[PDB]
Structures are given as structure tokens and as C-alpha cells.
Design a binder for this molecule. Sequence first.
Ligand SMILES: CCCCCCCCCCCCO[C@@H]1O[C@H](CO)[C@@H](O[C@H]2O[C@H](CO)[C@@H](O)[C@H](O)[C@H]2O)[C@H](O)[C@H]1O
Ligand SMILES: CCCCCCCCCCCCO[C@@H]1O[C@H](CO)[C@@H](O[C@H]2O[C@H](CO)[C@@H](O)[C@H](O)[C@H]2O)[C@H](O)[C@H]1O
Ligand SMILES: O=c1[nH]c(=O)c2nc[nH]c2[nH]1
Ligand SMILES: O=c1[nH]c(=O)c2nc[nH]c2[nH]1
Lengths: 468, 480
Amino acid sequence: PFFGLNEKIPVLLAFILGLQHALAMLAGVVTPPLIISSSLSLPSDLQQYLVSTSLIVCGLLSMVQITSGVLSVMGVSFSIISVASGAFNQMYSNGFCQLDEAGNRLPCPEAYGALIGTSACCALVEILLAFVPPKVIQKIFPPIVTGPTVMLIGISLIGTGFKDWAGGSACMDDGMLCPSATAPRPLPWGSPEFIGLGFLVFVSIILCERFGAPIMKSCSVVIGLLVGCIVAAACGYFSHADIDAAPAASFIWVKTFPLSVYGPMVLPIIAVFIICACECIGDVTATCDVSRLEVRGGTFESRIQGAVLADGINSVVAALATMTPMTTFAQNNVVIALTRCANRWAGYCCCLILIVAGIFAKFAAAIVAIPNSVMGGMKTFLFASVVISGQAIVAKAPFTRRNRFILTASMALGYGATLVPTWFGNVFPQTENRDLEGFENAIELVLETGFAVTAFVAMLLNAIMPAE
Amino acid sequence: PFFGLNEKIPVLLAFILGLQHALAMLAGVVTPPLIISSSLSLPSDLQQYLVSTSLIVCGLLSMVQITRFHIYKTPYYIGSGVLSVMGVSFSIISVASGAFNQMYSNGFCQLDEAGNRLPCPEAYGALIGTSACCALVEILLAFVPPKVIQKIFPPIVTGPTVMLIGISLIGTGFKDWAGGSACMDDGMLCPSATAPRPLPWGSPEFIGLGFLVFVSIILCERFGAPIMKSCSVVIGLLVGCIVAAACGYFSHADIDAAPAASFIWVKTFPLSVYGPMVLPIIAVFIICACECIGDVTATCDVSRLEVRGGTFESRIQGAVLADGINSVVAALATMTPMTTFAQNNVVIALTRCANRWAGYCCCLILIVAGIFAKFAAAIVAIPNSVMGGMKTFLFASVVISGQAIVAKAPFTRRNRFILTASMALGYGATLVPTWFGNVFPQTENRDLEGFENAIELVLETGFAVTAFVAMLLNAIMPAE
Ligand SMILES: CCCCCCCCCCCCO[C@@H]1O[C@H](CO)[C@@H](O[C@H]2O[C@H](CO)[C@@H](O)[C@H](O)[C@H]2O)[C@H](O)[C@H]1O
Ligand SMILES: CCCCCCCCCCCCO[C@@H]1O[C@H](CO)[C@@H](O[C@H]2O[C@H](CO)[C@@H](O)[C@H](O)[C@H]2O)[C@H](O)[C@H]1O
Ligand SMILES: O=c1[nH]c(=O)c2nc[nH]c2[nH]1
Ligand SMILES: O=c1[nH]c(=O)c2nc[nH]c2[nH]1
């Protein structure tokens, strides 16, 4: 029995589907804060804070776009991570941030502040380019451009999942419970126990699919995460100390970050917001097919415009609420499709469940206190799924010798751009300092980003290549 | 004017298209000897030898599968009777990485714990012995199983495996582009990185070289004439190598020091010698069988022929039979397993000619190129960076092609899930160095432990893992 958008359902059902959505998107909302924090800072205080903050903010802005007028689940984007890797690396290299003992980086919140200032800046850049360009964008970024970019995003990100899976990127410290690899500067090291953990998560997800009932759908990642986490607690991999030490409350601004602060990663941020625009379009349309609605009507394109507008608006809002850019989650469309319900009430239930979970900031702490390995397996599955979906996007464009060539050059040159650390030999080979050099550093940022390069090559070839 | 299989075409035309084919498959034939050799030994004698030897033997066994006049007497025949270009497979590299790694680790081969690995020809002899052994494992399983194999290795299983083969192999391409996997030595011309044990290090110049090769390929397509097709790779390689010579990246000393002759057994390798990588070899030949099937069918559609006829499947049977037969033949000739080259189907389609005379001219051109063993050395004398850009393009194309294979199956949540797990776990299996914690955690030595090492070999292999996960999931997962 398929449920339309606007109809009251048994409120128990609405709550339950709200829960399934909440759990489904949980991994996707939770993981990027963990990734950004670990790659910049240590304090568990701030991690618990940003997980709970994320939960609350995401609940709120999902509520904002659920009223688009169809189940429009919103959550933190994964593109901003791939940008921030290169960003932070340069901030620690030629930037202002500081280093210790050859490897260990000092937490540098001014970087995050720059990130939020810049992203808040360029969210506007996107909302103002959100107005009336629907099919045009579809033409400018076809699946032959779209697919490779996304594939390489998931690929370049999968490394961190595998690293945590290993037990990294920084192996456990002194006096901390259950060290099985203790060392400064081992990014991909870890003992067999860690492998077994992440693998048990992965296998847990797989079995979760094999014996998967309509509720367990899209929770398989989160359920696997949970299973591996329970086994983890059974073995003794936990820090109940920091769990106890965490506060059981969270307001949106318990902790705050620098303002009037921006970086030179402005353009990559703009690129991220474009990505989020295209993604929003695809995700919303998909929902419309899932929700048995119009797919080309004027009302449809109105839904898309509202979706993208609310997208960038909530990017600004989240930035003010100390959150990085966020976009449309695509897990839900599965849930809806298999549960036959696209009611706004499931989404709102979800939203409230999230905000509430964020308030009880012990859940956040329990999340931060999940071993790097369980997180590792779960995330590796996650990014793997991203790669696979980018590929599914690829296959929408006819595989001719032309498209195969364009994909080849874009993939290879993009990932090739990922491999290289940095460039210098031109304006900066002698370590020079001109007005350009500071934005030579910005060019370094774009160049270092893999998917940016991929997208540039794809668009360039599709432009200059002859029609087969 | 579309030219059929059997029609005399201007022998100038047949020769020229023979040349285009020769150049087309040149890179794909030449590269695996370079990769296996560099990853085992140093002597330029053996590299030049195996390059020219590869040219010769592939020409000969291409001649073996282009015709059916060799075996057909009464029953089903060998090999194919339409353009069936043959050349050394890339699966054997992906296997030989882990294989050789285990041979230098727990095997007999030696190292001196200071700089590069000692050359170990007995490893190659084991490789060849084992592969020659299992080519027979594939030919006798080459008899009458056509659509069956298609069902056992559908696109959902087929595609990921190929992708990961391409992925885990591409690393050597990038490494060479950088200037590796061992940066240039002392007194050797144009060292820009000299060091023991830097596998992916290298200066800007190396980047510039390989990148000029790659850019040369792209520009070769951009201004590409029908002859330059599938030569774009070899043309880019050539361009970047010319530029390389211009900068001064050349070793005319070893080029001069090379012999201008090459017979099939100028140099030889151990016999009665096998490793424990037998099963990985069987996997290689399964790969090559399916590969033959798909490549041939592609050719039949290119050459305007039957696609479901009995004659068609007869052609396939012959293709796989000649595949494994030429695998044994090549192995006796000190060559690794070889299978059907798929570049050609483009050329034909773009040249409207599937004449066996293009193929035979090609073959002769290759064998002749192999005899003149100064070309072989000229190939060996290409900087690792030029080689790098070119090979990188090659493997990237392998991955993408595996993906095109993938897309043949309806992208459902089921198929997406299976792809996800298969890719992730295969590549993860690639990441880990080795396992021990069970039968060998205490460094034990029982009768099993030696083939515990074989399980270690398959386990280390990325695509084998990928495929096992893929098939197991596709089996036990319910139909969506
Ligand atoms: C230096 C230059 C920088 C230039 C930067 C510009 C980058 C532009 C890249 C485009 C981004 C790709 O945007 C992509 O859009 C498609 C639809 O088109 C979304 O949608 C795709 O995947 C989702 C799964 O989650 C499906 O629901 C959908 O049917 C499919 O098309 C992708 O999830 C998103 O990743
Ligand atoms: C531990 C377990 C070990 C068991 C290992 C088993 C591995 C077997 C993997 C199957 C190998 C993949 O085999 C694959 O077959 C397809 C057809 O399906 C071939 O063909 C595919 O690509 C070629 C391009 O080159 C196209 O011409 C063709 O149309 C396409 O189908 C591929 O070139 C080959 O790579
Ligand atoms: O789980 C997720 N689903 C998504 O759609 C998405 N987009 C960015 N980041 C995301 N994470
Ligand atoms: O150039 C190549 N093309 C191929 O299809 C192939 N298969 C194995 N080895 C190969 N080399």
C-alpha cells in the first residue's frame, strides 16, 4: 500500500519510519565530522560537540526542505572532506597552522573557521546560481562528466576508511585502553585485531543485507557498524572514561569558531556547491519517481528550484550553526520505495529524532568513542558504495570509444593529480613571495584536489572531442 | 568498401594495415615482459631478449589462431578463422607480483638486504613451468562450454575483477611515470633521482616526460586520422620518448651493445620447475578463456559475421583452443600465458577490413621486428617516465573497460551492493602484505605450510578475491 505525500498515517508508523530514516542517514551525517576532526584536532570535547551539533542542525534543515515539498532529507556532504584534505595540508604547510615531532599536527580551529567563513560565503554563490537553470546544468554536467568526478571522489576518500580500518591514521596512544599498535606517525599500520574488527563490520553489513527485512534497509551500514561495535565492546575496545566525562546536553553553539575568517579555498568551495546543486537535482527527481509524482512538470521544476534554494540557504544556516556545507541524502529514496511511503511525517519524525539524539549528547560521545576500526570498516563500505554509485552515474552515457577514452583520461589524470604532493617550479620554486604566490597556493589547492582535476579533464575532452 | 575475411586486397593495403595492427598491439605485447623482468632481474641481455622473443612468439601464435588449417581434420577445430590477434596477458603480472614477492620472502630466491633484489631466473622458470602446465588445464576445459561460461562469469562478476586487475596493476604505471620503481643509479645517464629503495620518488622532469606522453596520446586522438587509431598510445609513447631523447634521456651505449639478431631460444629458462601459484595460473587462464570469448564475439560483430550460429561457437571453440595451445607453445618458448588482444576490433571497425592478410602482414611485421633485436633494445632504452605515462594510460583503459563490462547488468540495489562489497574487499585484500596468524603465526613448518603459502598467494591477489566475493554474493543474494 503506497502512501502519498500529504496524508496522515498512524503516528506510530510515522515515528518508526522516522526512526528508519534517522538510522539510515545516521552514518552519513555522523562520519564527516569524525573525518574532519581527526584530520585537524584531537579534543574529544569538540568531536562530541560536532557530532551532536550535526545531528541537531541536520534535523532542523531537513525540516526546512521537507516543507521542496516531498521527503527531502538533508545532511552533511562528503565533497567538502576531499576539498578540506588539500586545504588543511596546505594550511599546515605554507599556511598558519603548526606542527610537532615530525608527524603530529597541532589542532588548528582557525582553519575550520576559515572553512566555515568561505563555505558560508560561497553557499550564496550557489543560491544565486540556483535560480532558473534546470536542464541547462544537466547539459553542462552530463553523466560523462558527472560519473567520473563522483567515482574519483569516493575513491580518493576510501583511503581514510581503509586507514582507520587498519587502526590509523594515528595508532592508539599511551594508557589508552587496548593499544595493539602504539606509535607516532604510522598512518596505515595496525595489528590483525583491527583488520578483524573492520572486516566484522563489513561482513555484518553483508549479512544485514542477506537476511534483510524492509526495516533493515539502508541501515545495513549502520547495523553492521553497530554489530561490530558490540563485538568491539565485548573484546574490550572502549573508553567509558571519556563517555562518562562527556556532557549530557548540547545547544547549537556550545562551542564556537572564528568569523571574518576565510581561506583561498574559495573556488573549491564553489565547486563543492555546484556538485551539491547537481546532486540535489538528481536526488529530488529520484524521490519524485519514488514518490509516484511528476517528473517533468512545471510543479516538478518548482520543487527542484525550492530544493536547491533551501539547499544553499541551509548551507549558510549550517555554517552559522558551525556546520560545513550540506546536501541531499539519497539513502531515503530506497527506504521510501521499499516501504511505500513518502509522507512528510516520516521525514519530520526523522528530523525530531535526530535533533533529540543530538541533545542527548551522550549518543554523540558514544559515537566518538567508537574504535577507529569499526568506523574503518563501516566507512570503507560507505565510500566504496560512493564509488559504485558514481559508476552507475557513468553508465547512463552510451559507452562509445569516445566516452571510454574521455573516462580513461579523466580518471587517470585526476587520480594522478591526487598522487602528487605539491607543485613549485614556476612562481614558487625558489620559495618566492608575491601577491600572486598566495593564490598560486589556491591553484595548488585546486590542482591537489583529485575530482576537480577529473571534472576539468572530462569537461575539456567532451568539449574538444568529435561526435562519434 | 567493407572488406571481408577472404578477399585479396592490395598487398600494399594488406601490408599497411598489417603495420597499423602491428603498432597497435606492439605496446600491449612488449609491456608485460618489461614489467615481469624489471620486477625480478637487471641484465639488459634478458630484457632485450624477452622483448624480441615476445615479438616473435606472439607473431607466430597469432598466425596460429588466425587460421583453422592447422588442426581441423574431422571433429571441432583449432583455432579461429577470422582476425584473432594474440599477445601476452596482463593477468600474469598481477599474479606474478604476489608470486615473486612470496618467492623472495619464503621461497628460494635471494636478496642481500641492501638495494635491489638479486636476479632470480629460476622463479621465471617456475612461472613458465606452472603456466605451461595449466594452459592444459584451460584447453581441456575449453571444449564445448560456450554460453555456460557466460552464465558462470556474468557482467556482475566479470566487470569488477577486470576493474581491479587494472587498478592494482596501474600502480607500476604511475611508479614508472615518477621514475621508479627504482630511481636511476650512479654513472648512468641523466640521473635526476638516485637512490636505493625509493619506489615512488622522482623529480619534476619525470612527471613532465610521462605527462608529455599522456598529453601526446590525447593530442593524438584530438588530431587523429584512421591510421593513428589504437596507435595513439604508441604514438604518444613515441613522442614523449623522442622528447626524452631530446632532453638527453637515452643510453646509446647499451643500444649499441645489443645484438641485431634474435632466435626463439637465444636465452633459456629452467624446466621441470613449478611454483605453488598453480591455482592463480588456472585463474589467469579462466580469465583468458572468457577474454577470448568476449574479444572474439566482438570481432565477429565488427567483421559482420554470425553472432549465434553453430559456426560462430565453433569459431569460439577454436579461439580458446588455440589460446591455450599457444599458451603452452609460448611457454616452451620461455613466454608467459597469452590471450586475445582486443584493440584490433576498433581498427577493423574503423578501417572496414577484416581480411586475414592484414593479420598475416601484421604477424610477419612483428616477427621481423623481433629478429632485428636493436628495436627491442631501443624499447628497453625508453626512460621509465615515458613508459610510465604510456603504461598508465594502458591500465587506466583496462579499468574503464572492466567498468563497461560491469554496466551490462541492470544497476539494482542488489548489483550495486555486490559491486561495492566486491570492489572494496578485493582492493582491501590488495592493501595487506601477508597473513600468518593461523598455521604460520609462530613461523611453523608442516606439510601444509608450503601451500598455506599458496593460499597466501591467491589471498594477496586482488582480483581473485574481488571475484570470489562477487560470485559468492551474486549466488547467495536474492533476486531483486
Ligand atoms: C576545477 C573545476 C571544478 C569543477 C567542479 C564542478 C563539479 C561538478 C560535478 C558534478 C557533480 C556530480 O553530481 C552528481 O549529480 C548526479 C545527477 O546528475 C547525482 O545523482 C546520481 O546519483 C544518485 C545516487 O545518489 C541518483 O539518485 C541519481 O539518479 C544519479 O543521477 C549524483 O549523486 C551527484 O554526485
Ligand atoms: C580465487 C578464484 C579464482 C577464479 C578466477 C576467475 C577469474 C575470471 C574472471 C573473468 C575474466 C574477465 O573476462 C572478461 O570477459 C569479457 C567478456 O565477458 C571480455 O570482454 C569484455 O571486454 C572486451 C574488451 O576488451 C570487449 O571486447 C567485450 O565485449 C567485453 O565483454 C574481457 O575482455 C575479459 O576481461
Ligand atoms: O550518505 C550520504 N548520502 C548522500 O547522498 C550524500 N551526499 C553527500 N554526502 C552524502 N552522504
Ligand atoms: O593490449 C592488450 N590488450 C588486451 O586486451 C590484453 N589482454 C591481455 N593482455 C592484453 N594486452
